[PDB]
């Protein structure tokens, strides 16, 4: 076939019921994740090719960057709760990997302040139990698929994208192959 299990994707030996349609995992410490976000715009090109009715979900993970890794998972919960993902994603990536000016929770907080979220609103969210349960959801989704690496994308809790099996001579061709694969799996 043109798309083969173990080639552009793998199948989960243990499917996950009720899982989000398109589920993406990343870390602000993850170097290919930085690429996926600022150079390749994966999420965005996937969305452009997905059918109507398909919602897209993105979660942060704890297993990179120790203590700061966890703070970032909680900050991402804050970003999701306030709906400000598109304003903090780039400065968080660059603060962690480019300028290396993010070293503590207070530095993460600064990124949100500079993006215009109010201190009082940020700290309230940070400490809220809605954000607690959003952190729980991120952890549970990752646990469900025994996730040990990022970036990762899962389709309907049963297929996992395998970018290692796609040409990388051309960044544009890679992205389209990736997005077309998500669509194919989506229609499966």
At 140, which CATH number? 3.40.30.10
Q: Could you tell me the residue range of the domain that residue 118 belongs to? A: 1-188
N-terminal to C-terminal alpha carbon distance within the chain: 14
23 DSSP β-pair partners: 57, 154
Experimental method: X-ray
If we measure between CA atoms, which residue out of 132, 168, 81 comes closest to residue 176? 168
Measured between alpha carbons, how far is 136 from 15 in angstroms, rounded to an integer? 20
**What CA dihedral angle connects 157, 141, 102 and 119, to 10 degrees?**
120
What 133-138 contacts at long range (C-beta under 8 Å, 24+ apart), as own/partner pairs, is: 134/77, 134/80, 134/81, 135/73, 135/74, 135/77, 137/59, 138/59, 138/60, 138/61, 138/73, 138/76, 138/77
What is the CB neighbour count within 10 angstroms for residue 158? 18
Say if CB 173 and CB 45 are below 8 A apart: no
Whole-Å CA distances, 47 to 55, 71, 107, 158: 9, 28, 31, 19
Report the number of distinct structural domains present in the chain: 1
């Amino acid at each position: 076939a043109q798309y083969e299990d173990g080639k552009q994707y793998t199948t989960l030996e243990k499917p996950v019921a009720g899982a989000p349609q398109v589920l993406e995992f990343f870390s602000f410490f993850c170097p290919h994740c930085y690429q996926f976000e600022e150079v390749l715009h994966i999420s965005d090109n996937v969305k452009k090719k997905l059918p109507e009715g398909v919602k897209m979900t993105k979660y942060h993970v704890n297993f990179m960057g120790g203590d700061l890794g966890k703070d970032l998972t909680q900050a991402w919960a804050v970003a999701m709760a306030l709906g400000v993902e598109d304003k903090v994603t780039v400065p968080l990536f660059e603060g962690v990997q480019k300028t290396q000016t993010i070293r503590s929770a207070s530095d993460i907080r600064d990124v949100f302040i500079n993006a215009g979220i109010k201190g009082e609103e940020y700290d309230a969210a940070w400490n809220s139990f809605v954000v607690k349960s959003l952190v729980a959801q991120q952890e549970k989704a990752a646990a469900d698929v025994q996730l040990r690496g990022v970036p990762a994308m899962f389709v309907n809790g049963k297929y996992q994208l395998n970018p290692q099996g796609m040409d990388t001579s051309n960044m544009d061709v890679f992205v389209q192959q990736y997005a077309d694969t998500v669509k194919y799996l989506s229609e499966k």
